Amino acid sequence: GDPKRQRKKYETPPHPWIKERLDRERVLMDKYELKNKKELWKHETQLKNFRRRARRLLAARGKQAEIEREQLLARLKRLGLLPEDAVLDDVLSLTIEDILERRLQTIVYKKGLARTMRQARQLIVHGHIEVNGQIIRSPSYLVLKEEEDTITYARTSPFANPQHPERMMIEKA
Template sequence: MGDPKRQRKKFDSPRFPWQMDTLEAELKILGEYGLRNKREIWRHKTLLSNYRGIGRSLLGQSVDERETQEKQLLGRLNRLGILHEESELDDVLDLTLEDILDRRLQTLVYRRGLSQSMQQARQLIAHGHISIDGQKVSAPSYLVLREEEDKIEYSPKSPLTDPDHPITRATSIPAEPMLPENEEENKNE
């Protein structure tokens, strides 16, 4: 049967975890994206760091040496929807944590209007109510590919497919956009 593989950490923890500005920034991201703990932030920061490190090493090589690896890296980031098709290698270095967090299934479920909040999106995914192209996905941190983005829906066997379900009714009611005070005054005039 062979030896089992050793489980390794998929993230690097911060060097100075108790700095106030780091704590505040991480706490803001936790609330904004509905993450469970800071380990999820660190996992995505490590992924971003790996992509940026590959980009830096490729920029140090000559154009002939890096051509195929550059196409592979840009192709991968394009398939994930993090970069556009016409992006260049310099754009990899400009990526931020929010670019990766915006591609999480949890974020896309909320942005598509299938849930009322990020926390509810996480719960719907964990309970098996969300599918991608008919395949149930139960990981909120799943990075959705660009081609899968339009195929996010309620699972076929989920009770949420019923239009009379309270959650479905609540999310299908279009909310009126909030206008700043200046625009409201201009409309009344």
């Protein structure tokens, strides 16, 4: 009899040094400008959990099984990882890049609010980005589809002024 112990939310690679895995992870890190490998492993295990849930639900029968299947599909569609007309089979086709593209940093960069991923990360950390009115300072936050169009400069941040030198530099792109 032992009490609860809070667990890690990421899984380390089975072998620290594999050439192909190291090269692939290095490419992903360079592309998405993540701070360290634990963030990438966190997203990888998120994808793994989704895939495991889909695999378990595929071969399950029962009202609870149908409810869980519907909830999984609805949650993925809400997160924006799958189209509206998706099916459970389409879950297994998800890739790490799909999750990486939903990060607040990536969406901020894509929307043209920052010249580069590093600039977007600094903006998020310093609180120049507001999501649905709230200011979120977590670059790894997964933006929901329903609120993807509400991301913009904080109404009090200097970046909100169109005449700001940094804003003009960003717009010059």
